[PDB]
Design an enzyme around this catalytic site. Structure first.
Site, short mmCIF file in Angstrom:
data_model
loop_
_atom_site.label_atom_id
_atom_site.label_comp_id
_atom_site.label_asym_id
_atom_site.label_seq_id
_atom_site.Cartn_x
_atom_site.Cartn_y
_atom_site.Cartn_z
N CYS A 195 0.72 -1.20 -0.12
CA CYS A 195 -0.06 -0.30 -0.02
C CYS A 195 0.78 1.32 -0.01
CB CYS A 195 -1.09 -0.03 1.20
SG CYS A 195 -2.21 -1.14 0.99
N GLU A 227 0.09 2.62 -13.42
CA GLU A 227 -1.33 2.81 -12.77
C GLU A 227 -2.13 3.57 -14.23
OE1 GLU A 227 -1.03 4.61 -9.04
OE2 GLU A 227 -0.17 2.77 -8.09
N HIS A 257 -5.44 2.46 -5.99
CA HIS A 257 -4.45 3.25 -5.34
C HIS A 257 -5.49 4.21 -4.44
CE1 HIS A 257 -1.04 5.39 -4.23
NE2 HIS A 257 -0.50 5.59 -5.52
#
Ligand SMILES: Nc1cccc(-c2cnco2)c1
Ligand SMILES: Nc1cccc(-c2cnco2)c1
Lengths: 195, 195
Positions: A135, A166, A184
């Site tokens: 994370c 991403e 995210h």
């Protein structure tokens, strides 16, 4: 900083999701199935959590998961072992950490020293069936290595909020049955976003 | 007893999953989407958790979620307030509890007095956007009332491990976008199952 707790909270969530397969179980129920033997899980109490990066977020993760009776060890190149002991994190050298961990969570920046922190070399030194959480920053965990370790069972699951690219163009990690993921969302709370 | 922690751990898992929509986010990512605005969540820190049933499991839940900075209040007809205070849970009468809670979790037996403990009357006394967890016994939360409160937004989400009928024949709760669910996995760990 103002988003430290949002991050830490998502991380704890991911660990719980890995231990009990809650996202998979939900998908299974939503598909009209009732699959109880498929989703046998593990208790966190008495397990070892390795925290790589013992800054504000890793700190906060630690004290939360201590409440579950997890043993919290870790490594940080700057923070002293006596300081980390003050928030219940036992520091060991990285080579000591890999074999002990039932769960590993990363809380580092993305640097040359941390890019592929978890890679084929370090997954081999893990206990079989380790569960991993990123994370923090895409790339800390080598995505190829991770896929390989999920394929072999060396890694029993992973939880990813972040990706080298991403949105992720390579879909093999996201699509794996033992991988849980979010787009995210670590900082995406009303509170974090709203000073 | 030997499964108390497995229960409590799943309950905390579900609370985290409600706060951050990790199962929904995982399904979204699995479908090739990157939906960051859709899955804006909330922090647990500073929120109020109502625990109805303050036996071993509700106790264990409490001390876990206190580490996240949740305020823990509750109600139990049999457990003394001095015992509950010993583990940080403020006992109030049920009418006092409903309006205060951001999250509500049930840890009771299935008795006439607890069947529909959460029902249309008690959802109306809740704060708007309450989130609910049932990892105890199917029927404590009235399933019709719950669906109605999900439809209006009075209940912003629910997590269910148990159902009035297992597997559930009526699919409207399981199918709701704000409902996470498992096939009664509260005791399904290797440890619980394996004395
Ligand atoms: N190599 C390694 C391992 C664990 C933490 C880190 C780290 C954190 N802050 C800068 O580097 C680096
Ligand atoms: N009505 C209500 C509310 C909260 C707990 C209970 C409860 C627990 N053990 C026996 O009954 C009952």
């Amino acid at each position: 900083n103002g988003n430290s707790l949002s991050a830490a909270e998502l991380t704890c969530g991911m660990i719980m999701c890995l231990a009990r397969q809650i996202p998979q179980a939900t998908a299974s129920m939503k598909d009209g199935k009732w699959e109880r033997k498929k989703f046998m899980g593990t208790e966190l109490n008495g397990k070892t959590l390795g925290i790589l990066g013992l800054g504000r977020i890793g700190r906060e993760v630690a004290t939360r998961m201590q409440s579950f009776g997890m043993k919290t060890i870790g490594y940080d190149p700057i923070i002293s072992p006596e300081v980390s002991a003050s928030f219940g994190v036992q520091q060991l050298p990285l080579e000591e950490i890999w074999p002990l961990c039932d769960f590993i969570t990363v809380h580092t920046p993305l640097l040359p020293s941390t890019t592929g922190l978890l890679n084929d070399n370090t997954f081999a030194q893990c206990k079989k069936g380790v569960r991993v959480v990123n994370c923090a920053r895409g790339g800390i965990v080598d995505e190829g290595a991770l896929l390989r370790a999920l394929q072999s069972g060396q890694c029993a699951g992973a939880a990813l909020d972040v990706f080298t690219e991403e949105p992720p163009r390579d879909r093999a990690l996201v699509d794996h049955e033992n991988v849980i993921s979010c787009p995210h969302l670590g900082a995406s709370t009303k509170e974090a976003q709203s000073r």
